[PDB]
Amino acid sequence: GYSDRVRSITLGNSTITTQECANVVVGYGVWPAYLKDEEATAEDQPTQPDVATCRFYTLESVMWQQGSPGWWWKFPDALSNMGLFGQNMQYHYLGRAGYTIHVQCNASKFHQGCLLVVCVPEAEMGCATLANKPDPKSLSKGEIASTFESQNSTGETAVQANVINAGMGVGVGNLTIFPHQWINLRTNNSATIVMPYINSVPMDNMFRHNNFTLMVIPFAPLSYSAGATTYVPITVTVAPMCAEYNGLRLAGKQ
């Protein structure tokens, strides 16, 4: 009694069910796990919240439309405001963690469209204006998704959001090297990735560095005939995995 669509994931007080899936993409084949004494530098004992932090936080939803170019969410921060995760995140200088990203979107057998769900580690972005650097608010808005554009972005300090380049000066159609799954309304329902901690250092600050960005770009525009339900939302749900923290002190960010 099963279908390689069926699926039940549980972490803490949260639980995910999948009535339509492919498989589950797992980072670079590497499954997340706690930092070993052999790869560590911080000598103080780390905190491992566990259940209190490694659970499923569900960000604000977004509406998909026939013109929607795409969306993205920086990650170390985005959960900066989620329960005890965001907290341990404010009281500590260092932290490291893996994640279980689950993008959910559903239509009917009569709707059609296709989304690309990827996890770009170290997604440095360019500025709309060659001479400057894009301001923080343009880079990430926490749980509020940021948007790509179906054209060139404009001046001052915004990000060069034109989708064709994912704001990174590359060919949008090549993002497929990073961990990803496709949500093809016709056969899909949800996408699930398991990003492990990926960085050139055992641990890092969480407000100063975004070790990866989730992007949801539609390659096959949404469509439907008149009469069909017109509002098709997309919802991102993420869960920290094996979060450790070091260097405790007062809270904030400089």
Query: According to CB under 8 A, which residues from 169 to 228 bind another protein?
Result: 169-184, 187-191, 193-194, 198, 200-205, 207-213, 217, 219-221, 223-228
195 Cβ neighbours under 8 A, 6+ residues apart: 27, 32, 98, 99, 100, 101, 119, 121, 179, 212
The type of residue at 110 is: F
| Cβ proximity to another protein, 7 vs 216, nearer residue | 7
Euclidean distance between CA atoms 3 and 170, whole angstroms: 37
* # residues near another protein by CB under 8 A: 143
Q: Is 63 in the site for another protein (CB under 8 A)?
A: yes
- Cβ count within 10 A of residue 159: 21
| Dihedral of alpha carbons 180, 56, 198, 124, sign | positive
Q: How far apart are CA 16 and CA 10, in angstroms?
A: 6
C-beta separation of 113 from 223 below 8 A: yes
Helix (H, G, I), strand (E, B), or coil: what is residue 164?
A: helix
Q: Min. distance of Cβ 146 from another protein in angstroms?
A: 13
Verify binding: residue 11, another protein, rule CB under 8 A: yes
Q: Is 34 in the site for another protein (CB under 8 A)?
A: no
Regarding 231 and contact with another protein (CB under 8 A), the answer is yes
From 165, 96, 95, select the one nearest 127 (Cα to Cα).
Answer: 165
Q: If binding is defined by CB under 8 A, does position 82 make contact with another protein?
A: yes
Q: Return the residue matching tokens 């469209």.
A: 113
Binds another protein by CB under 8 A, chosen from 66, 150, 154, 156: 150
Contact 200, 30 (CB under 8 A): no
- Please report how close the Cβ of residue 188 comes to another protein at its closest, in angstroms: 5
Residues between 92 and 121 that touch another protein (CB under 8 A): 92-94, 104-112, 114, 121
Residue type present at position 228: A
Quickly tell me which residue has 């209190």 as its tokens.
52
Q: Pick from 1, 36, 37, 38: which binds another protein (CB under 8 A)?
A: 1
Residue 146 makes contact with another protein by CB under 8 A = no
Asked if 91 is part of the footprint of another protein (rule: CB under 8 A), the reply reads: yes
Q: In whole angstroms, how close is the CB of 167 to another protein at the nearest point?
A: 9
Nearest distance, CB of residue 57 and another protein, angstroms: 7
Q: Give the nearest distance from C-beta 156 to another protein in angstroms.
A: 14
Q: What is the nearest approach in angstroms of another protein to the Cβ of residue 128?
A: 9
Shortest Å, Cβ 71 to another protein:
14
